[PDB]
Amino acid sequence: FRLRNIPLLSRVGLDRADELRSNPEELAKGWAEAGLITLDVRGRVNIVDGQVVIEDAARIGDQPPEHAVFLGRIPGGRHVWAVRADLDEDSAPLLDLRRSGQLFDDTSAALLATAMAMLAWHDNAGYSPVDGSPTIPAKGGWVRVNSATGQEEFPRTDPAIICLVHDGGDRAVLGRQKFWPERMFSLLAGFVEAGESLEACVAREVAEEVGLTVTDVQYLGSQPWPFPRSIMLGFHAIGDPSQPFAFNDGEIAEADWFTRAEVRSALEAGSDSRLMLPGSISIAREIVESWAYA
Amino acid sequence: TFRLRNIPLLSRVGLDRADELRSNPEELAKGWAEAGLITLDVRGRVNIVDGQVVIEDAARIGDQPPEHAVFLGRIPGGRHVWAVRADLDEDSAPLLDLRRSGQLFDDTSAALLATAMAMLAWHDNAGYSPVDGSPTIPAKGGWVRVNSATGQEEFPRTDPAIICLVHDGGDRAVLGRQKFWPERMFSLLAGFVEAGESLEACVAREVAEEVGLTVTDVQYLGSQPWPFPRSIMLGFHAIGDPSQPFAFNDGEIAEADWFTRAEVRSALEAGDWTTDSRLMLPGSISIAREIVESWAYA
Numbered sequence: 001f002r003l004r005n006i007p008l009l010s011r012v013g014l015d016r017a018d019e020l021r022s023n024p025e026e027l028a029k030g031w032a033e034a035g036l037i038t039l040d041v042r043g044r045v046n047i048v049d050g051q052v053v054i055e056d057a058a059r060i061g062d063q064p065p066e067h068a069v070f071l072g073r074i075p076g077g078r079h080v081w082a083v084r085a086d087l088d089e090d091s092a093p094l095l096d097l098r099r100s101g102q103l104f105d106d107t108s109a110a111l112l113a114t115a116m117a118m119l120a121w122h123d124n125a126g127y128s129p130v131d132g133s134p135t136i137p138a139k140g141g142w143v144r145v146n147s148a149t150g151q152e153e154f155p156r157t158d159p160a161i162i163c164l165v166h167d168g169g170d171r172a173v174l175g176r177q178k179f180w181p182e183r184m185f186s187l188l189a190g191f192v193e194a195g196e197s198l199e200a201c202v203a204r205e206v207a208e209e210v211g212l213t214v215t216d217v218q219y220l221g222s223q224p225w226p227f228p229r230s231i232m233l234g235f236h237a238i239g240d241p242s243q244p245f246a247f248n249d250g251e252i253a254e255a256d257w258f259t260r261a262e263v264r265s266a267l268e269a270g271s272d273s274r275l276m277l278p279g280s281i282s283i284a285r286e287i288v289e290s291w292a293y294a
Numbered sequence: 295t296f297r298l299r300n301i302p303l304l305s306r307v308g309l310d311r312a313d314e315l316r317s318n319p320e321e322l323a324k325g326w327a328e329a330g331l332i333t334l335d336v337r338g339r340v341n342i343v344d345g346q347v348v349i350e351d352a353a354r355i356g357d358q359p360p361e362h363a364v365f366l367g368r369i370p371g372g373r374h375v376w377a378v379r380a381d382l383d384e385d386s387a388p389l390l391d392l393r394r395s396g397q398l399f400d401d402t403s404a405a406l407l408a409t410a411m412a413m414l415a416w417h418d419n420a421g422y423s424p425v426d427g428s429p430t431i432p433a434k435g436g437w438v439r440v441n442s443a444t445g446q447e448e449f450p451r452t453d454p455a456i457i458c459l460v461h462d463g464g465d466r467a468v469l470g471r472q473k474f475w476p477e478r479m480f481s482l483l484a485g486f487v488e489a490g491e492s493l494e495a496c497v498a499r500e501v502a503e504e505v506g507l508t509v510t511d512v513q514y515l516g517s518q519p520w521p522f523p524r525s526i527m528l529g530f531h532a533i534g535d536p537s538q539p540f541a542f543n544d545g546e547i548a549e550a551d552w553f554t555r556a557e558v559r560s561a562l563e564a565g566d567w568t569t570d571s572r573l574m575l576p577g578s579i580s581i582a583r584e585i586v587e588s589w590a591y592a
């Protein structure tokens with residue numbers, strides 16, 4: 001099977017205008033009538049008519065500040081930037097783009113995903129991992145330069161796999177983590193280690209978490225996941241129900257095989273039956289859904 | 295259209311990484327008695343014997359496993375195996391680096407070395423928290439570094455990069471030459487994944503930047519660890535349109551054209567970047583060569 005829909009946040013991006021990042025002058029010239037998006041500490045943002053709030057940008061400075069991040073151009077040719085800031089409690093702020101991002105258009109969601117991962121990175125990359133030195137933003141916020149050595153540090157996106165193990169027919173593995181509300185299962189996920197391919201990572205993470213041996217590992221799609229800095233790569237793989245479970249790396253409290261039937265009805269639910277699926281914008285939902293209605 | 299014919303080098307086997315033991319100091323110490331040791335110089339080079347990475351008896355550097363070492367897992371039989379950085383004599387024995395000699399290694403050895411190489415390099419570049427600045431200390435068989443002030447864990451970094459074959463849906467495909475390569479040397483289009491984009495959007499973005507084409511039907515082919523120093527390469531193909539002219543916007547690309555399967559097959563047979571004619575293909579151990587090859591022979 002294949003994914004039915006492109007997952008939220010993946011539907012192409014903007015004109016990120018790589019060119020201009022290394023061109024301080026052009027940034028300054030376009031800043032006059034630039035746009036500004038603003039994110040609080042928790043990554044919350046404002047929305048209006050299904051669209052991200054874009055202030056007039058000049059109303060915080062003459063020039064673009066160092067702590068800002070240049071996001072690109074929007075249809076028409078107008079620059080757009082992002083800053084970390086407090087937000088006004090007297091607006092409509094979204095606590096989690098993760099749980100509410102379906103309210104936004106594709107463009108706005110792209111802006112926000114970019115802005116959110118970058119700002120979070122800045123907040124976690126003020127020092128070189130190499131020596132310890134302070135670091136300084138540059139190039140529209142797309143690098144941080146070591147203050148001692150001049151060496152560039154770049155935005156960090158950790159790849160993670162998320163997998164649906166199925167039997168090749170009508171059944172599929174879902175699992176629940178230690179502290180999750182009961183009756184709540186989802187796909188198996190794990191970070192890619194150094195020295196392994198995605199395919200090997202899937203097989204490894206599945207074996208660790210539920211003790212199955214899988215084959216026929218196939219990619220379904222991908223999704224930026226700024227919480228704070230993942231990119232999720234979706235897979236499916238064939239397991240064997242006869243092989244018993246085993247919770248070695250005990251991140252998984254409970255797991256079972258579920259029927260297509262069970263999953264379809266669990267998808268419709270969202271306090272009745274034994275399986276319930278958490279309701280987010282995740283590619284996880286799109287994978288489960290694309291399998292269950294093959 | 296197509297799938298990869300071969301599993302790309304460095305992906306051909308997974309180790310028994312023995313996740314269990316990393317958080318179990320005792321079991322590490324018990325198996326260290328008859329453990330194996332791989333040793334890498336600063337440049338990631340190692341010694342090999344009969345196409346296999348050299349695994350010393352491990353006790354000959356310690357009573358116990360040192361802090362700077364990295365636990366790689368088990369080998370068939372159940373024997374532990376570790377890796378350390380050390381200076382090695384350039385002159386007493388040949389030192390091989392995976393980048394140019396990975397084809398000479400067996401699959402297991404190549405996996406071990408790729409893991410060991412990316413991890414040790416990471417340690418050398420993660421002695422301080424990026425967050426605050428504090429020293430950091432290896433732990434859990436070297437798979438984390440703990441901040442000394444806060445106790446917060448830092449983890450190994452792998453940067454994803456895409457590499458793409460743009461084809462017309464039939465018999466032609468885009469290849470390009472970077473300004474900083476020799477003059478008859480072409481390959482696929484590549485790029486790092488930026489924050490806030492999916493792989494598919496990255497492919498479309500990087501293709502548009504480098505050669506100014508608009509692509510659709512972006513499909514994954516496979517992946518390959520790329521510890522030079524810390525990438526993972528994700529291979530794709532996409533459909534372009536030959537009638538749309540080229541344009542070298544983000545001028546990393548000096549020249550590019552559409553090539554026939556015929557042309558590419560004969561270019562593959564001539565040689566790669568290391569080895570007459572106007573097209574010659576970089577890629578030996580790269581998934582790039584495997585993608586081009588898998589497309590050109592159907």
Ligand SMILES: Nc1ncnc2c1ncn2[C@@H]1O[C@H](COP(=O)(O)O)[C@@H](O)[C@H]1O
Nearest residue numbers: 142143154155156157453454486487488
């Ligand atoms: N995580 C990253 N590591 C290295 N280079 C990166 C990364 N993310 C983006 N880049 C860009 O990749 C280019 C470096 O090319 P290269 O010399 O092949 O590493 C520059 O334009 C960087 O801004």
Ligand SMILES: Nc1ncnc2c1ncn2[C@@H]1O[C@H](COP(=O)(O)O)[C@@H](O)[C@H]1O
Nearest residue numbers: 158189190191192205249251449450451
């Ligand atoms: N590369 C990584 N980046 C961030 N956290 C990681 C990484 N590798 C392992 N972890 C930690 O390991 C936990 C679960 O491991 P996993 O089974 O790989 O999902 C995560 O919640 C993280 O705290």
Ligand SMILES: [Ca+2]
Nearest residue numbers: 017018503543
């Ligand atoms: Ca551009």
Ligand SMILES: [Ca+2]
Nearest residue numbers: 088089090091
């Ligand atoms: Ca107010």
Ligand SMILES: [Ca+2]
Nearest residue numbers: 188189190251
């Ligand atoms: Ca997990």
Ligand SMILES: [Ca+2]
Nearest residue numbers: 160189190191
């Ligand atoms: Ca995860």
Ligand SMILES: [Ca+2]
Nearest residue numbers: 190191193313
């Ligand atoms: Ca793991």
Ligand SMILES: [Ca+2]
Nearest residue numbers: 208248313314
């Ligand atoms: Ca295990």
Ligand SMILES: [Ca+2]
Nearest residue numbers: 190208209249
């Ligand atoms: Ca795990």
Ligand SMILES: [Ca+2]
Nearest residue numbers: 255256257258
């Ligand atoms: Ca059952």
Ligand SMILES: [Ca+2]
Nearest residue numbers: 383384385386
């Ligand atoms: Ca010499």
Ligand SMILES: [Ca+2]
Nearest residue numbers: 484485486546
């Ligand atoms: Ca590039």
Ligand SMILES: [Ca+2]
Nearest residue numbers: 455484485486
């Ligand atoms: Ca690259």
Ligand SMILES: [Ca+2]
Nearest residue numbers: 485486487488
């Ligand atoms: Ca890039």
Ligand SMILES: [Ca+2]
Nearest residue numbers: 018485503544
């Ligand atoms: Ca680029």
